[PDB]
Structure 1
Amino acid sequence: MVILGVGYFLLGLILLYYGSDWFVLGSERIARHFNVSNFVIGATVMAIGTSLPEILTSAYASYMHAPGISIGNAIGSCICNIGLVLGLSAIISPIIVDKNLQKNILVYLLFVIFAAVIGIDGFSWIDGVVLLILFIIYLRWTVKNGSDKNNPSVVFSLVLLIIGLIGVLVGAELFVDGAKKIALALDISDKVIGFTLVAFGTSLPELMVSLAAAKRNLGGMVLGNVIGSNIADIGGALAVGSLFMHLPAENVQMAVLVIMSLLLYLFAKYSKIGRWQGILFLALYIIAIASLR
């Protein structure tokens, strides 16, 4: 079970490589038909596509009585998205943000701040419902604010979007499956490896898709996907997980997240999310994962 591990591994990379590229092309075309910006389609359709493994993970974790995991993995992804994902994407393709996109980003900053404030004592099922509503309020607002019978072109767009999404979701669980077989053959029979490599497996569709878009200089789409995913992780993953059990409090991760969200706001308004900014986001990401033990 070693060449099978590599076989699963390399196959996963193939389904993640092309899958994310099709998911981006499908999304870009869909945005053109629904007559919305690359940002809007990234903060809604794309976000929910890549943020689904994060919602299902949190909800299940809190279901089987592991709440500290459900929240720790919920916020840890938001930081991973601004730190690793956005950071890497900005180095590849610097992001100049439009002026109609900043109202959206400001809303994101406030929503994160709102989550941090009510998340000091912890997270009730009350907080969950509140945040769950705000999520939907955000979605219908993002689509509306920035805005057919038998069309062969639209169909092709949906094929790219659906096959592309199936590709990255399958490729991610082939990535993990293969890496686990390799790790086992390597001597790593520890248990945090069975949550570290899987936590990375949930952020893997998000990382790949954002990189695929970054390669095609879709800075707006990249930004939308980061913004949308974090809200889907907080307004959705963090919220749904709180319906089962009372999630604990992490006022050090939330603090860091607000900082990275604040920096994102300032960069996407008075400057840009370019290469040096991305380096900083990466720097803040590595002085975090090391200083948070």
Structure 2
Amino acid sequence: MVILGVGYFLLGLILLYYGSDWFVLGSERIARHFNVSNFVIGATVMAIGTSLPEILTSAYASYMHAPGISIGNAIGSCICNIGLVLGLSAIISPIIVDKNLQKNILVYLLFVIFAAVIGIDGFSWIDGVVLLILFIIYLRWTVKNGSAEIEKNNPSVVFSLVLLIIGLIGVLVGAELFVDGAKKIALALDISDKVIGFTLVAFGTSLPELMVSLAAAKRNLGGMVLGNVIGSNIADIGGALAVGSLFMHLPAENVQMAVLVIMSLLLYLFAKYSKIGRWQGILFLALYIIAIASLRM
């Protein structure tokens, strides 16, 4: 049957749509509770939660002797977060970046370049261990700098945590349904293609970031969007790629890493010397479009 594919697909969108808004709302509240910025909650809790698909996908693929899918998924997500996710969000809600957030973005940049350089001959399991350690350090460093918490069964907090978790479950399940529904529609229309079907789940892992960021964008939560983008990329590299490399050596993806380094560099330069708004967003989307037009499938 195919309506099951249609049912799923539509339901996936509904869970994604409402799930994303609840995730954003709950995350914004949690940040106020812990006295940290929206960037910080976006870069830690939101980034890790929405990167769970990438982490499972890369670990699974490398385990199943498909390390090309594992690194392809990780870095492709990174390119998607800056090009598509941040591109759309910048246009919706232009961001002027604070001096301290610029420091966080510069560190992100350094991290990406380091990853690109040690991955020129691919990524070994020791490359993995190192990247994962830097990931852990980035998280502690980010929270520390974004913290002002100097000081308990509060209904405000509990309600905040419930919005967040149910929202997350909503976007993660919604995303799966979207992919699963699309897969079944494709199969019973007999238009299924593996080469393209890998980019259905590849894009699939990026749907949480997309919807969550757009939801944050609609509520002018610019720092949260930026936090979620920066953190998700780091989680995709220090987490998804890294764990992949633990099961098997990952072949180099130098062209894609170069594209990521160029987009990351652009993202930093705009954050430091300008803004992340309309035309910066238009630039990110144009670059993203060119990438999905010309990069190897």
Q: 1:50-91 deviations in whole A, cap 9, x for unaligned?
A: 001001100110001111111111111100100110001111
Decide which moves more: 26-35 or 168-177: 168-177
- The percent identity for this pair of structures is 100
Aligned-pair CA distance for 1:177: 1.7
Look up the match of 1:114: 114
Aligned-pair CA distance for 1:189: 2.3
Q: 1:156-191 deviations in whole A, cap 9, x for unaligned?
A: 000000000000111111111211222223331222
Q: 1:122-159 deviations in whole A, cap 9, x for unaligned?
A: 11111111111000001011111111921110000000
Q: Distance in 2 between matches of 1:279 and 1:201?
A: 23
Aligned-pair CA distance for 1:222: 0.2
Q: Distance in 2 between matches of 1:8 and 1:67?
A: 29
Aligned-pair CA distance for 1:195: 1.5
Q: Distance in 2 between matches of 1:78 and 1:167?
A: 22
Decide which moves more: 262-271 or 139-148: 139-148
Unpaired stretches in structure 1, ≥5 consecutive residues: none
The question of whether the paired residues in 1 share the 8 Å contact of 2:77 and 2:203 is answered with no
Aligned-pair CA distance for 1:258: 0.6
The ranges of structure 1 where at least 4 consecutive aligned residues each deviate by more than 3 angstroms after the TM superposition are: none
Q: 1:248-278 deviations in whole A, cap 9, x for unaligned?
A: 1111111111100000001111111111111
**Equivalent pairs, count:** 293
Look up the match of 1:55: 55
Decide which moves more: 97-106 or 152-161: 97-106
The question of whether the paired residues in 1 share the 8 Å contact of 2:97 and 2:271 is answered with yes
Q: TM-score under structure 1 normalisation?
A: 0.98
Q: 1:99-144 deviations in whole A, cap 9, x for unaligned?
A: 1111100100000010011111111111111111000001011111
Q: Distance in 1 between matches of 2:261 and 2:94?
A: 22
The alignment partner of 2:246 has SS state of helix
Q: Distance in 2 between matches of 1:150 and 1:109?
A: 40
Matched, 1:286 2:252: no
The question of whether the paired residues in 1 share the 8 Å contact of 2:61 and 2:67 is answered with yes
Q: Distance in 1 between matches of 2:192 and 2:174?
A: 23
Q: 1:28-66 deviations in whole A, cap 9, x for unaligned?
A: 000001100000000000000000100110011000111
Q: Distance in 1 between matches of 2:133 and 2:110?
A: 15
Aligned-pair CA distance for 1:194: 2.8
Q: Distance in 1 between matches of 2:244 and 2:188?
A: 34
Look up the match of 1:179: 182
Aligned-pair CA distance for 1:3: 2.3
The question of whether the paired residues in 1 share the 8 Å contact of 2:77 and 2:233 is answered with yes
Unpaired stretches in structure 2, ≥5 consecutive residues: none
Q: Distance in 2 between matches of 1:40 and 1:128?
A: 24
Q: Distance in 1 between matches of 2:4 and 2:127?
A: 45
Q: Distance in 2 between matches of 1:175 and 1:280?
A: 28
Q: Distance in 2 between matches of 1:102 and 1:90?
A: 16
Q: Distance in 1 between matches of 2:124 and 2:59?
A: 14
Decide which moves more: 187-196 or 276-285: 187-196
The question of whether the paired residues in 1 share the 8 Å contact of 2:76 and 2:202 is answered with no
The alignment partner of 2:292 has SS state of coil
The alignment partner of 1:289 has SS state of helix
The alignment partner of 2:194 has SS state of coil
Aligned-pair CA distance for 1:92: 1.0
Decide which moves more: 172-181 or 216-225: 172-181
Q: Distance in 1 between matches of 2:7 and 2:73?
A: 29
Look up the match of 1:158: 161
The alignment partner of 1:149 has SS state of coil
Q: Distance in 1 between matches of 2:295 and 2:63?
A: 26
